[PDB]
């Protein structure tokens, strides 16, 4: 329930700084490797919890081929952990392949919902 605009704001302030990007990005990459969702054949945007209207609009607005790829990666992850194994090492999601694909859709749906709730509580300056 942290909004992705907050995460993106803190993350962009980290990434555009010279000093703490070169400190904080290696510990993030080690965190990503130790997380081990890639060993199950999942990108990170398959991990975002989808039972909220923002993620439902983002998954509805996601294009058709990306949605089929996401559905296969989820079904393969369920089938993999059902057998208590991992995917073989040639089937792991590589680091250049782990892209944020759902993130622009989530960000525009979140900006639309925040603009909606700012306009619903608007006050004219009379």
């Amino acid at each position: 329930p942290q909004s992705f605009t907050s995460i993106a704001r803190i993350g962009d302030y980290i990434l555009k700084s010279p000093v703490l990007s070169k400190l904080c990005v290696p510990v993030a990459n080690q965190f990503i490797n130790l997380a081990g969702y890639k060993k199950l054949g999942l990108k990170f945007d398959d991990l975002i919890a989808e039972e909220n209207p923002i993620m439902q609009t983002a998954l509805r607005r996601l294009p058709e081929d990306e949605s089929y790829a996401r559905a296969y990666r989820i079904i393969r992850a369920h089938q993999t952990e059902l057998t208590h194994h991992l995917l073989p090492r040639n089937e792991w999601i590589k680091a250049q392949e782990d892209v944020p694909y759902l993130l622009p859709y989530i960000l525009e749906a979140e900006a639309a919902a925040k603009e909606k709730d700012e306009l619903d509580n608007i006050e004219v300056s009379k």
């Binding site: 509805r60 607005r61 294009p63 639309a112 603009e115 909606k116 306009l119 608007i122 004219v124």
Partner: protein, 352 residues
């Protein structure tokens, strides 16, 4: 960028940007309907929700209308709110977002609703059949998108790039200062649109005569005739269209509707007979053309025609200014014919 305005001592202004981008100029069947239904969606700087909320708090409404020749962007508002509505129309023409999630969620269901309510009237069905058999691939393009040829989003962006040019639009204000409007349509984004070319032709639209089309339909039956009109014979067919639906005629108990659509380069006179059973509309349309093939004098209906033309060109102040004084007689020549409904009981063209 013709900018004209007509002042008044009046509370409510209105402001229309008319582009030549209607169904006459559609590169695919119904790309103009989708651009029209797309018009007041969100732009780059302002969302579509924010425009509706800010315009309500300022006190006005937007509308986008599609006919055969034009796409009209109208804004009705309180009088001293002019540069907001000018910049809103300029932003809509210049920088609309053209998002696929707006095509698939709000524009395509609205267009599907438009086509589904226009299908239920057999008069609009017969009217577009009439346009299609009189003019073929000019004005005979369909008004509304029905998905017969698939229109993608890049087609809508290409059509908007074609028709939203600086040479193809007219800014037309009512109850508004012309010096203020002319100051506000430059000092704007209407003055940095592409200066393309105006798509209107000065030629004649290549009509066709003696054609016939029959389509089956469940409901009311409509028999319709249609006559293409050149530019110089426009006033005579308008006096006929007002004579045939008035009390001067013996035929308006039979004629359900009759009108004349006027364009820059001519027009089309349409006549519709509509009823729920086919024997009535069959005998009616036989009587109409049998007594229109003998002549009719229309000089009784000239003053009535001047009145109806005044009350229907009071709204828009770009009318055609016909003369009406030199019209005397009419005799029906050749004409196109459309049956809609119970077509195996409606008469054929060679039986009229």
């Amino acid at each position: 960028l013709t900018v004209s305005a007509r002042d008044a001592p009046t509370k409510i202004s209105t402001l229309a940007v008319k582009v030549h981008g209607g169904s006459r100029y559609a590169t695919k069947d119904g790309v103009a309907h989708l651009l029209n239904r797309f018009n007041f969606q969100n732009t780059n700087t302002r969302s579509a929700l924010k425009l509706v909320r800010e315009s309500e708090l300022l006190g006005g409404t937007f509308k986008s209308t599609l006919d055969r020749e034009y796409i009209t962007l109208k804004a009705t508002f309180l009088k001293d709110d002019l540069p907001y509505y000018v910049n809103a129309l300029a932003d809509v023409l210049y920088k609309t977002a053209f998002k696929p999630h707006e095509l698939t969620e709000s524009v395509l269901p609205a267009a599907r609703y438009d086509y589904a309510v226009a299908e239920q009237c057999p008069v609009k069905s017969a009217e577009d059949q009439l346009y299609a058999i009189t003019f073929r691939k000019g004005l005979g393009n369909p008004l509304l998108y029905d998905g017969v040829e698939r229109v993608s989003l890049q087609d809508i962006k290409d059509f908007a790039d074609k028709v939203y040019t600086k040479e193809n639009l007219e800014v037309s204000g009512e109850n508004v200062v012309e010096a203020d409007l002319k100051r506000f349509v430059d000092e704007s984004l209407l003055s940095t649109l592409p200066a393309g070319k105006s798509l209107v032709s000065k030629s004649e639209p290549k009509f066709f005569l003696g054609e016939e089309n029959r389509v089956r339909f469940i409901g009311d039956s409509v028999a319709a005739i249609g006559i293409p009109v050149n530019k110089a014979s426009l006033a005579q067919y308008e006096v006929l269209a007002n004579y045939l639906t008035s009390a001067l005629s013996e035929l308006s108990g039979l004629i359900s509707s009759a009108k004349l659509d006027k364009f820059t380069d001519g027009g089309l006179f349409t006549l519709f007979v509509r009823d729920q059973d086919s024997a009535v509309v069959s005998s009616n349309i036989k009587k109409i053309v049998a007594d229109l093939k003998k002549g009719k004098d229309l000089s009784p209906a000239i003053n009535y025609t001047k009145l109806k033309n005044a009350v229907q060109n009071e709204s828009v102040s770009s009318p055609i200014e016909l003369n009406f004084d030199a019209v005397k007689d009419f005799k029906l020549g050749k004409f196109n014919y459309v049956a809609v409904g119970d077509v195996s009981n409606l008469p054929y063209l060679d039986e009229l």
